[PDB]
Symmetry: C5
Subunit: 312 residues, 5 copies
Amino acid sequence: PVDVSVSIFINKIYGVNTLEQTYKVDGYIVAQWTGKPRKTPGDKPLIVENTQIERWINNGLWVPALEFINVVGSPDTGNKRLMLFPDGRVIYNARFLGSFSNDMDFRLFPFDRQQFVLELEPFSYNNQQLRFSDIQVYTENIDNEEIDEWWIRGKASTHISDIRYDHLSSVQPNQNEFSRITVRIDAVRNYFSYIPNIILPMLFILFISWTAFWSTSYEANVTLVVSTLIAHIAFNILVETNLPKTPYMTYTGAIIFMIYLFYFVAVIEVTVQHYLKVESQPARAASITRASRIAFPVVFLLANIILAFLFF
Amino acid sequence: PVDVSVSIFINKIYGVNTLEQTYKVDGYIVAQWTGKPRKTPGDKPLIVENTQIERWINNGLWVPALEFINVVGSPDTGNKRLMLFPDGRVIYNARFLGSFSNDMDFRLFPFDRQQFVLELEPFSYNNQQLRFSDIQVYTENIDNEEIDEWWIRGKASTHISDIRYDHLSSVQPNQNEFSRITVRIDAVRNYFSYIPNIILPMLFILFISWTAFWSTSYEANVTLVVSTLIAHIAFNILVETNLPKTPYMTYTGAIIFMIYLFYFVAVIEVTVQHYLKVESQPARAASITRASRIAFPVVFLLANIILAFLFF
Amino acid sequence: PVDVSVSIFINKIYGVNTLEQTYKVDGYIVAQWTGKPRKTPGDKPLIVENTQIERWINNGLWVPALEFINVVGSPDTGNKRLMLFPDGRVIYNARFLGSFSNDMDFRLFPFDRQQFVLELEPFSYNNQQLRFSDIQVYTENIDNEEIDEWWIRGKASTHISDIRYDHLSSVQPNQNEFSRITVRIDAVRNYFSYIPNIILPMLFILFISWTAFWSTSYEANVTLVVSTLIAHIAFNILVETNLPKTPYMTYTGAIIFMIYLFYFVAVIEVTVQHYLKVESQPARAASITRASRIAFPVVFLLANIILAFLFF
Amino acid sequence: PVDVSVSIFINKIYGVNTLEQTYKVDGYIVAQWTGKPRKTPGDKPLIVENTQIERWINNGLWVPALEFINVVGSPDTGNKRLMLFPDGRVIYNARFLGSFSNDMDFRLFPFDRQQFVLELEPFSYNNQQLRFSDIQVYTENIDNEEIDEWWIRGKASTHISDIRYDHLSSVQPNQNEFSRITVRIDAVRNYFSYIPNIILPMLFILFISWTAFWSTSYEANVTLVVSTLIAHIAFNILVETNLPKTPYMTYTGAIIFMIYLFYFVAVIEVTVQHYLKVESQPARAASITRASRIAFPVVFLLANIILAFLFF
Amino acid sequence: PVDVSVSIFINKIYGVNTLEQTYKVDGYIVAQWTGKPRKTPGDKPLIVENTQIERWINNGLWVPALEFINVVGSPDTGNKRLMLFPDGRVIYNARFLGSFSNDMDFRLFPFDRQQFVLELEPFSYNNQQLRFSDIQVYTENIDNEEIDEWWIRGKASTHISDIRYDHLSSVQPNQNEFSRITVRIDAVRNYFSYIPNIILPMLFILFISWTAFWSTSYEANVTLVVSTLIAHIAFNILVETNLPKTPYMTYTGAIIFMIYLFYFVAVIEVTVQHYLKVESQPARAASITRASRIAFPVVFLLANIILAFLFF
């Protein structure tokens, strides 16, 4: 079992896709493994570059196949460098930029909780142990909390585990166990701009519909409730890109669907106020309007607390 | 006929395109075929990596051309590994991520039924049999049914068949028969979020138009039916991306087109109610409104059941 | 002149761009040319794969440069295979997926007529004849006419021609003549879904504006004609992607522009009806409304027949 | 100084970006330079293909670095061919498809004037003269003037110049002068479809707002001017993609901004007409409406002529 | 320590992304380092091209790994050229086009201040000094200030620094110091078109809502304030692409959110004016309207000055 020291540097974690549950990660990968003693020109260790790296393997130099398990497509390896030491050890430094998949829960978008995971397992070698994992997410979080989309919390989670496989070759009494690095950086999305850009204006439009709970004129009432619903849909179109859309139900989506009913229900109230006045019963219509004038804001507050009580 | 054992691992089936009938599939491909006996360093079998794989073929090592028949463009092969055994057999392990085409029926979108097919046939060898196919879709479906867009039902369908060709070379008395793997995983789209985000709000807007079947004021009636049609088109704009658009007629599209008539027809009713009152015949207008107040909801229910009876 | 037998298989003709006049074509290319006699291991012909193909050319093996003339960018060649026969002939099989340019006429979109052309000419060899062209568009059209976007009509058009060039080198007394394959598959776009999704709803919105030709209330009339124009523009936004937009005038675009006038003209009528009633002359306004109530539908029908008479 | 004959063929000039001032150009590049005498098999000149081209340079064959100066990114070179003559000269034929940058003036979009420039200078050789430039834009313009987006005027502009550099090496008494080809094809955008699709309907919506200069009812007046402004913004959304948006002010943008004022000003007029009638002074309101009924169309005509007088 | 003279030419700084804080930079890179004396054919220095550059490294020629630190993905290197001098020095000229990341502050968009930074550090060599940095942004700024999106101010900022690292190898306590080039060009976004296209029309729509501070009719008042809010959201949809959206609060976003309240508040005023007239207290409603007729424009002016006082 060849011991490999893996040190991964983290520079950027950008472009979090709300559909494919993908995110682009940039940095550097360092693999210091003890090889076999070789002769370098003099005492100083040899420095080999990307083009000449393949030339060394042809001559009889070992290079282990360390592949990312959760990588979506082939990641972009910039410049790769092999540092052959006269003593024996070899240091492999390579810049990488690729897409990584991890199960994401967007259920509670306004106060999002997400984990960015990176996994590495040698593609061809099982009885070749991975010594120690090191995550250097030295890109300062408290430096620009407003500028950074995600508030980096904790200097990642180091985890080294032996992944057991089932479907393999004929000889597996102790070949099914592959060493695997499990890097997991945590982050919390900043609500800072999501309230005065999405939440707050989507609420005002809904309360503007509620101004028909004072107005007696049905012609003016229709214009309020119908047009605000147009404004709500229009504003939901503007937002949509910022909004995360997943196959499951969300707290934001639950509120968004709840708003659609509170328009439909208000339309009913306004129409009820009208038909009562038409059928010479305005005494009911008078109290019906006064009721919903206090009921609607209370009911929406109860239900928003109900949703929050279920999601949190 | 060289016997080839093909074991394909399935990791992800993501990004289902509603137009091109394409979907991205990620995993691993294993090809264990009995070659010719060779000498490996000692007893242990030789492990060859991607860069050195081409070097072996030049020396005189066999590598069969196993191409995906239904692959759209050249798929992304990550790291490929050849395992040369001293006895004779060779195990080929390669990570793949590519686009696959299959005939899809989106006719019934809210309760979608789809099959994800993967086909493999040796590009150059016909009298080279494919021994056994194995599909390892071990990515747990019941684990996160709400999170997964498609509910993976069944551990795929293994199918090995001899595909017969017509247009070939000169020598074809028994060369037209190529061995082909036919992998078909089944899945059902979760309706869970499609009802409170698309179906339900598209219905409320249509019923808000129906509130003119109580109102006597034509000026207020126009504002209802005309503006709700604006809201419906606006909401159809928001949805559109989620909506699958194909060259054939769909259950969703049939309902969507039916809604467009139920606005146009309601406009007619409202205008009829007006001209009758204008031409001193309000007795008809009074019953005309009361009729459509019960008729419209019944007619739409009948027709929605009619459509459902035709599609299902 | 080396005789080359070219047989092109057609699998898919997908993604027809309405702006760049491009379409993606997938299939296989077969080039059977009589080379020089060589010795294969035994009697059986040698099978050479993509990586080893370049190795043969270095040793002294001929490979002709067959490039697509109408290809947009470098097309994606999947797996290429050379079949060296002991007698002399060589069969070249290669999978291709690329973009092809051809002059397209979208003038009559609802009942579209289009030709998909593919051209092949040897990039370097003029006095090297192309024997016979064969198009195998065996992807069944009548199988799924509703599912297929284009109804494949005819098993393509085989055409072999000697293309004469003007601007060449110094030596051209008989070097300007290059052999060229001209493959042209015909197809007709299915109107099936384009009427109940685009045409029909765009018409209803326009007739809803015409309901002001019965209404006497100007305040209610404005709401009709102005808001329907908003709905028309809104619906044209939804459609737009499905709609083909070219630098020339189309039948669809002519109707679309005609609809914009029929709103503007109706606004004038409604305003005329008003000013006449204001200036104590409602006798004119009464007949003015009754006139346009019969005129507008007749005029639009005449003009739609006029447009159809010009385009067809 | 090695004399190089450069003949560039033009096939397509497609996808003109209104932001980055980029356009994709496809064709062929021919470089006939007199090298050194070599022995070809017999008398016939040797034909070398793309893969074997690099093999010749290794043996000791010259290939000059002819790079496009105005190319955005590395352009797509399809198939490249070297024609080695026994006498000495070498003809280099290569198919290219790349993006080219040139300063574009979109100030007057409806009647656009644009120049498509292509520049070539040897990347490594200064005292290596470029003999003669030849542009073969034989893709017929008058063939399909309605189908072609740009009306190709003139068979391009041939220009060969010695570009002088300042920041170079140590030895520059006569090494700063590089030979450069300056190809410039001219074209004029067809207005044909831009008037009945963009200009004309954007005008009708603005005149529909002007129908409030006859109407006495403020409630009906508001519905006109407010909703037409919604329609104008909605129609500007539909158009936007066709509209060129640059960091400077345009004739189209000036008119577009002018339209936004003519709505705001009309709103003021309508509100003035109201407050005058409210404050028992309708004599002013009567003439105020009659004034703007003649003023607004005259003022907009004056200002549109003013803008046209400034831009042209 | 090998002294390297780095001279970077700047051609284009295009496509500034408001989300990822990225921008594409094109130009040339010159690296003149004193190598070892070699024999060139005669006295003239050897000119080596891109394909032959790798051939020289195999023979025993030094090429230092100069990588961009702030580069997003692998940048596009066009044609690279090595100029081997007989004396010893080697000049490396390479054309580049890549994406660069730098922390951007969009807080004050209408009068934006931005810095475009480019960093270069040898990927493999620390005790290999970078002699002098030279930035040639000779692409004239005052030439076309209206055409250029960013007004290039200053001929960049030359900065050479020794970057100290923490996580490294065993070999040296004085190996953590890498020489790094820090190029920073400054630019200011032109407001020229952002006022008559975004700011000015977004203001007119808001003042059109204020015309209800004269109107006594609630039915006409609702139509004003509700529809202008639709127009504002509609216009914000049109703009959105031009608008920079970041996770922090902006001056534009603050004004944009402030506008959403000024609609909601105006709705309240209009509804208050109504309920007062309903509950036989129009004396209050009369002064309430007259108050907000002077208050609203003054309050918005105060608050806009307040925001400007905080951001500037």
